[PDB]
Amino acid sequence: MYKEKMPDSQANLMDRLRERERRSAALLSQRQKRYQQFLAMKMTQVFDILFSLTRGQPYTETYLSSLIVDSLQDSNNPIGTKEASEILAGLQGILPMDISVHQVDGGLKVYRWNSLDKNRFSKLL
Amino acid sequence: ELGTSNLNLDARNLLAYKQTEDLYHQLLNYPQEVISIMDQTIKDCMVSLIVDNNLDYDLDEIETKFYKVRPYNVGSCKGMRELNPNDIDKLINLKGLVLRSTPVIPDMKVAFFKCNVCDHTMAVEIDRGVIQEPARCERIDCNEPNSMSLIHNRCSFADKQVIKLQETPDHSISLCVYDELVDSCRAGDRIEVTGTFRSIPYKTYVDVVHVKKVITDQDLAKIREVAAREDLYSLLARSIAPSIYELEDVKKGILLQLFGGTNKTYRGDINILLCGDPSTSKSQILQYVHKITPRGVYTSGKGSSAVGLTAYITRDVDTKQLVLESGALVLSDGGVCCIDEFDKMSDSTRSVLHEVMEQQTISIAKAGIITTLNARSSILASANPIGSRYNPNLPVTENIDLPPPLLS
Amino acid sequence: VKKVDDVTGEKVREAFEQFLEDFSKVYRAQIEFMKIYDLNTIYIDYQHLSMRENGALAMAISEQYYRFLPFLQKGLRRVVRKYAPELLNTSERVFQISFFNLPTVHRIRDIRSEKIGSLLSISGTVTRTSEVRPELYKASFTCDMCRAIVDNVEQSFKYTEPTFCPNPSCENRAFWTLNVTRSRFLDWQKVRIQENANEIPTGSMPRTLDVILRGDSVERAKPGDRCKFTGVEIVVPDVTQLGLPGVKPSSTVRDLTYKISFLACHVISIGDQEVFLNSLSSDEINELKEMVKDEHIYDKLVRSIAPAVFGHEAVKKGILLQMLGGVHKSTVEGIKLRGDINICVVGDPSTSKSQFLKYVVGFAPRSVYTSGKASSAAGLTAAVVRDEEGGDYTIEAGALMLADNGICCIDEFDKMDISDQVAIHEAMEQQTISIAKAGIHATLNARTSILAAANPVGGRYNRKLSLRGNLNMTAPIMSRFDLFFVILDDCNEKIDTELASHIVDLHMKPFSAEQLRRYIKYARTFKP
Amino acid sequence: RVTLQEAPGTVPPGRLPRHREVILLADLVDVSKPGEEVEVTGIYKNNYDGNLNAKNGFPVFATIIEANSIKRSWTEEEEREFRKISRDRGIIDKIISSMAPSIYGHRDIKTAVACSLFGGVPKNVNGKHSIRGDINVLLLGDPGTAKSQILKYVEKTAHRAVFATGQGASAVGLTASVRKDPITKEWTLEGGALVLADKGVCLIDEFDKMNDQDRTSIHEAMEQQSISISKAGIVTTLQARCSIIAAANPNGGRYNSTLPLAQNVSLTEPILSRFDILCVVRDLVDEEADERLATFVVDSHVRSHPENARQRRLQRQRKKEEEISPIPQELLMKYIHYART
Numbered sequence A: 001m002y003k004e005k006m007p008d009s010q011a012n013l014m015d016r017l018r019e020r021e022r023r024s025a026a027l028l029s030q031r032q033k034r035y036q037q038f039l040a041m042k043m044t045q046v047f048d049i050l051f052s053l054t055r056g057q058p059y060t061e062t063y064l065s066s067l068i069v070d071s072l073q074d075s076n077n078p079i080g081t082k083e084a085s086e087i088l089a090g091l092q093g094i095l096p097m098d099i100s101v102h103q104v105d106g107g108l109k110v111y112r113w114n115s116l117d118k119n120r121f122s123k124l125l
Numbered sequence B: 001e002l003g004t005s006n007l008n009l010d011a012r013n014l015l016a017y018k019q020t021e022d023l024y025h026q027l028l029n030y031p032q033e034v035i036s037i038m039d040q041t042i043k044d045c046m047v048s049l050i051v052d053n054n055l056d057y058d059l060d061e062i063e064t065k066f067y068k069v070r071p072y073n074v075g076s077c078k079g080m081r082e083l084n085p086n087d088i089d090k091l092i093n094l095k096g097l098v099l100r101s102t103p104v105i106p107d108m109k110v111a112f113f114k115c116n117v118c119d120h121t122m123a124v125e126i127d128r129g130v131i132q133e134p135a136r137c138e139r140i141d142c143n144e145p146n147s148m149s150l151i152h153n154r155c156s157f158a159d160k161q162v163i164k165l166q167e168t169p170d171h172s173i174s175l176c177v178y179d180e181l182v183d184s185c186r187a188g189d190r191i192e193v194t195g196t197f198r199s200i201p202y203k204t205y206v207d208v209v210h211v212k213k214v215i216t217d218q219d220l221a222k223i224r225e226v227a228a229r230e231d232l233y234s235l236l237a238r239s240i241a242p243s244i245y246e247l248e249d250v251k252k253g254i255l256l257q258l259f260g261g262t263n264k265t266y267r268g269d270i271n272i273l274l275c276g277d278p279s280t281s282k283s284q285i286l287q288y289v290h291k292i293t294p295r296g297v298y299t300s301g302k303g304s305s306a307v308g309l310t311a312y313i314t315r316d317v318d319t320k321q322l323v324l325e326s327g328a329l330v331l332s333d334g335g336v337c338c339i340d341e342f343d344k345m346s347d348s349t350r351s352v353l354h355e356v357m358e359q360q361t362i363s364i365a366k367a368g369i370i371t372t373l374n375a376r377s378s379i380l381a382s383a384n385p386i387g388s389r390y391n392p393n394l395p396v397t398e399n400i401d402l403p404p405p406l407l408s
Numbered sequence C: 001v002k003k004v005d006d007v008t009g010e011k012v013r014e015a016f017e018q019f020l021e022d023f024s025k026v027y028r029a030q031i032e033f034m035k036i037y038d039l040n041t042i043y044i045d046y047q048h049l050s051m052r053e054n055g056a057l058a059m060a061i062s063e064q065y066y067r068f069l070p071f072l073q074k075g076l077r078r079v080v081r082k083y084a085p086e087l088l089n090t091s092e093r094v095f096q097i098s099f100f101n102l103p104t105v106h107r108i109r110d111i112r113s114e115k116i117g118s119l120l121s122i123s124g125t126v127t128r129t130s131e132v133r134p135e136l137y138k139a140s141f142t143c144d145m146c147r148a149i150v151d152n153v154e155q156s157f158k159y160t161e162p163t164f165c166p167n168p169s170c171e172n173r174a175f176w177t178l179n180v181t182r183s184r185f186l187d188w189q190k191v192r193i194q195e196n197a198n199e200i201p202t203g204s205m206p207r208t209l210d211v212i213l214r215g216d217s218v219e220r221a222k223p224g225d226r227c228k229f230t231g232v233e234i235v236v237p238d239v240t241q242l243g244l245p246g247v248k249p250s251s252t253v254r255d256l257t258y259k260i261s262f263l264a265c266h267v268i269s270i271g272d273q274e275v276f277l278n279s280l281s282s283d284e285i286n287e288l289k290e291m292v293k294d295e296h297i298y299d300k301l302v303r304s305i306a307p308a309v310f311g312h313e314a315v316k317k318g319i320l321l322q323m324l325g326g327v328h329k330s331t332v333e334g335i336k337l338r339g340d341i342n343i344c345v346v347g348d349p350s351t352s353k354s355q356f357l358k359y360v361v362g363f364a365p366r367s368v369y370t371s372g373k374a375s376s377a378a379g380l381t382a383a384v385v386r387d388e389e390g391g392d393y394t395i396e397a398g399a400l401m402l403a404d405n406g407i408c409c410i411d412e413f414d415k416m417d418i419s420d421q422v423a424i425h426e427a428m429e430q431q432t433i434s435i436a437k438a439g440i441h442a443t444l445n446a447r448t449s450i451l452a453a454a455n456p457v458g459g460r461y462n463r464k465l466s467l468r469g470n471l472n473m474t475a476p477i478m479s480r481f482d483l484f485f486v487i488l489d490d491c492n493e494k495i496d497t498e499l500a501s502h503i504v505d506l507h508m509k510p511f512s513a514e515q516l517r518r519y520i521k522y523a524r525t526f527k528p
Numbered sequence D: 001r002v003t004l005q006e007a008p009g010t011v012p013p014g015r016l017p018r019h020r021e022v023i024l025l026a027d028l029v030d031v032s033k034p035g036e037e038v039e040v041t042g043i044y045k046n047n048y049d050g051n052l053n054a055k056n057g058f059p060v061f062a063t064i065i066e067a068n069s070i071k072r073s074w075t076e077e078e079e080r081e082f083r084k085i086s087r088d089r090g091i092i093d094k095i096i097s098s099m100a101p102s103i104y105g106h107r108d109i110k111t112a113v114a115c116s117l118f119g120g121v122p123k124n125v126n127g128k129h130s131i132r133g134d135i136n137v138l139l140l141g142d143p144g145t146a147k148s149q150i151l152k153y154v155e156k157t158a159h160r161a162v163f164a165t166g167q168g169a170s171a172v173g174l175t176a177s178v179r180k181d182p183i184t185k186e187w188t189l190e191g192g193a194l195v196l197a198d199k200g201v202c203l204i205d206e207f208d209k210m211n212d213q214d215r216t217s218i219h220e221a222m223e224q225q226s227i228s229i230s231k232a233g234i235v236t237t238l239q240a241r242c243s244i245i246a247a248a249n250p251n252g253g254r255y256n257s258t259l260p261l262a263q264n265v266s267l268t269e270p271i272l273s274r275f276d277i278l279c280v281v282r283d284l285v286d287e288e289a290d291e292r293l294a295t296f297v298v299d300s301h302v303r304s305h306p307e308n309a310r311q312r313r314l315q316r317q318r319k320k321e322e323e324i325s326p327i328p329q330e331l332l333m334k335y336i337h338y339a340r341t
Ligand SMILES: Nc1ncnc2c1ncn2[C@@H]1O[C@H](COP(=O)(O)OP(=O)(O)O)[C@@H](O)[C@H]1O
Pocket: B243, B244, B245, B278, B279, B280, B281, B282, B283, B284, B285
């Protein structure tokens, strides 16, 4: 309601918006960092899809990212297609030992994972 | 380097070399044998390049597995209807448009038999489409005759799919695909066929071996000469329609329709209305346009309907998914269509154009069917004025029998 | 006479029983729970199965599930005699296992013959269902020559008489008497699911599949629902393969036709604050929180509806409110109150309104797009179609039944016939469909928020007249629309210069579109 | 062989009517006829053995009930409790005030609902003459006057109620349908909405907007309480004793108070003649009328909104019934049933 009746501040109101302005950059980076943590944690419940029912290796990343979505993530917390690409692209980076994907002519192709202890490497987060 | 299981051989190299063409004529009646030899050759070539050349060491999966080879640009034959009973089982090359796809149909490759009295299991594989039932259990002790039983869901199967193609010889032919070639061809795909013409005791079909999903430098010199000359636009108008005199802007108009804009994802399907007097050669144009342009469809608004333009869609018992009978408008997908008598088109049919000229799609939701299509095309429209002649004493928007939503 | 032993199966069952005795013993508490409540089927989470031997136990169980099933059945039903023998009693040893919570959710688009015999989970919209029936899970026979009895006569996917009389003193074969009391039967149901609308690209067509349900998992499938199944793929003989091209194998003559089907053992349907909150991690919680606990979120989200469309800031509020429909209430008297919101939009043929419908149908969790002239009464509400496996009719989900608990979109509303505009009326307010046509008398849930677009009667807005005369929509339909917008265009230079500036940018080229669905999946819970 | 179907008021929300098959043997035949409601005791057995094992995947059967005895009833605690309320002075205004209490006003309409639920006496005068007993009601008026939600209340209150919608109902689907027997291959008839509602009520919404032919078949039911059919060699008449409550809209969607009713609607004198009570509704504007109605509705959404646990919460529900109704609703349903019997 009409709560802001008497905030009779001095000329510090200019300094008031410095706090609004000068600190907003760090919070935006933190929100960016949270999404990275948001993505870097979802991959834990993603590689179980790969480990469970795919052992042949004709799959390109376009098909798999279209199956990261419309999948177990199609739940109380859906995920985006471009995020799914970021999810699948992060797997090689976080696990270089078992995944080595290279550009073929256009796009990426995904091969049969060698696989290990599926989630012990999450300590890198 | 590739983790693939096959190679799409650049078969145009066969006509680019002398001895290969001689092989082609020899291979015209025996394509299977060489491909089977090439499979072992590919594995041997892999093994020789990996470990014999000592350039690699990952060989285990390749050595055990099986490969294939697919020539894709072999010289075309004399067309479909020109083939002969002896041309059956010969390698051919054809082209066409895919219309419909059947669902995944598995076929037997390995049969799993278990002895019903002693649980012994045998692995039986089919050769040349023959199932051989074991007569007795192979164990030394258990030898009961006819004891072997078949378990349906312990066998091994391979994908078999029937894809329907509208073939234009160098009529529609029902193609066939197997293994990884299934579901690689989907409705509306532009297709060139490299396979085997087949008719067996007799229906005409092609066992597709490979499928293709799709001039001189002197011509480039010829193009640049017209491209460089200053009378380019003047020459084009002077040369496009010899029968039609002058009409510089009309020459520029329809020509820009054929050039079209750029397509981004926003299409360049330019559409034109000829509001001319009902005696100026405009049918003489659009009849001529239908021929000169890359092959489209000639339609009349008076003689067309919403079903006639769009489609008739129904279910199929065998395929268990929707099938389409393409109308006039859909058949012009990606090309140019001419709609004469546009002023005489039925109101229900005219309602279709609204979504066509805004999204190039058509959405249908009727009894048992709910789906959307795509009909990206260019429209050339000619319309006589209201009455026997144009009446400039009335506003132009009143001389045209089209609503503002459609006229805009 | 010793029969062949499956050493891999014995290893699996030994690992199976060891897993049962060690998992913490919540599953044994469930076993005791079944004995207390007289239950038939035990349920096991796949991720619980996949956290032993680094999940390698699940992998062997998964890819060859149909083979290894009896070993797990023996593995458990030995344990039940170890700790709950009363479940073996009758007034006999019926026992079932139903897995769930698979990581992968394959589409009807993605059926391959390689998947036959493996464990997989799929999701598809239901179109028809069958009535429940008993299935002869295990039978027993008594001899005809002598009067010996044969028990545990399993019927694996076919009728199968015993192949011999066990006593050598008798020679009976292919002549048996079927017991109907010592024998056992189990529930059975067929579900005809359909590929989801969001799976099939434009121009492509939806695939169809038939799914089998057995056990207590039956009847948890209702038409129009987005169900989710878990089970294994199994092929069954087919009769429509005749006449196809290509060489067909033969048995020797006997035929060997097949068609693909999927067998499901578990059923669940995709959809109270604290129930929802605990299902998300802190990072998920914080990400969803940043869209709720910010002082300007209602201002922000309006500007995040169809960002390509310029202006029309009122419709961006209206649709956003329609996307968060109000609280459904039931009277203490028994009457129910609507919670969903209907919206209509009218503008000149230049004002982009179809773009809003395209955005809604491309963004909403469940949504259907249709056109005025193309649609019809039966296609919108309900389809009376003759059903298979019987001579009686069965409903087929119309446009409104699809995307139930969602948003339904209709374009060019003024072009619709009055006689087939009438059929939407009951669904707009009572959120139900009433049918009395040829032996069908049910009332169907139709909780849908109708969104419509239309143009004035004169094409352009006749600005000489008033709002009363430019619309052909009668009083009843106008009253039902909670919001009603008429947007107009003028020759204001300051607006057209900006309008032309950015529409060209389309051809030149706050919260993300994925964020809005995450927010809405939380907001829909509050009931002020 | 006789088919039993769930009672019309007992079908769970959003499902087709579940139904089974019953086997009548040994002089148990002809105990019931279409439209009758019966209770039967029998043996639950399976007998469908045949091509079902192969024509459908895997061996399955179907279930039947072999009927042993069948019956087509009040304790003292009920009747003795009724007579306490019965002796209350001026009971008529108590019942009327309890007709859908969460709707403000419309008392001269609620009385029509109250009178139709109790019905009259179906006087079969001297046998040779017959007169219908149930009261027919037509609700007509402007949108936003709860002409439909009342019909969503009569369904939940009357013993047997069948609900229908104008354009969603067909002539065959209301009166009767034609089928072929799956066992004897003979022409058989199946009852419709009116046949189901025998000794009950039929509720039609948007009565005007349906096509003329669908509206035409109603004529016989509203006076004869029967369905007469002649199709595919079937010549018979069924029992359709049910009151009809119909909601409609005037021509143009608004009621023209300056014109007669016969001119305000697309119907005609015949169709209007079969009705007993017509409830014309005007949505006229007035601040005092609006303040009373709005302050009632705004409180209705306060209470209908959510917020020995069984006993404690059941106490809360009847507490709110006392807030708005002089009669507990469960008793009133029984009280109507007792009065009708
Ligand atoms: N400018 C022109 N150039 C060539 N032919 C013309 C011209 N104007 C009229 N004609 C002739 O007049 C006849 C009328 O044909 P056209 O105008 O194309 O269609 P319509 O008969 O419907 O008016 C044609 O045969 C055409 O040859």
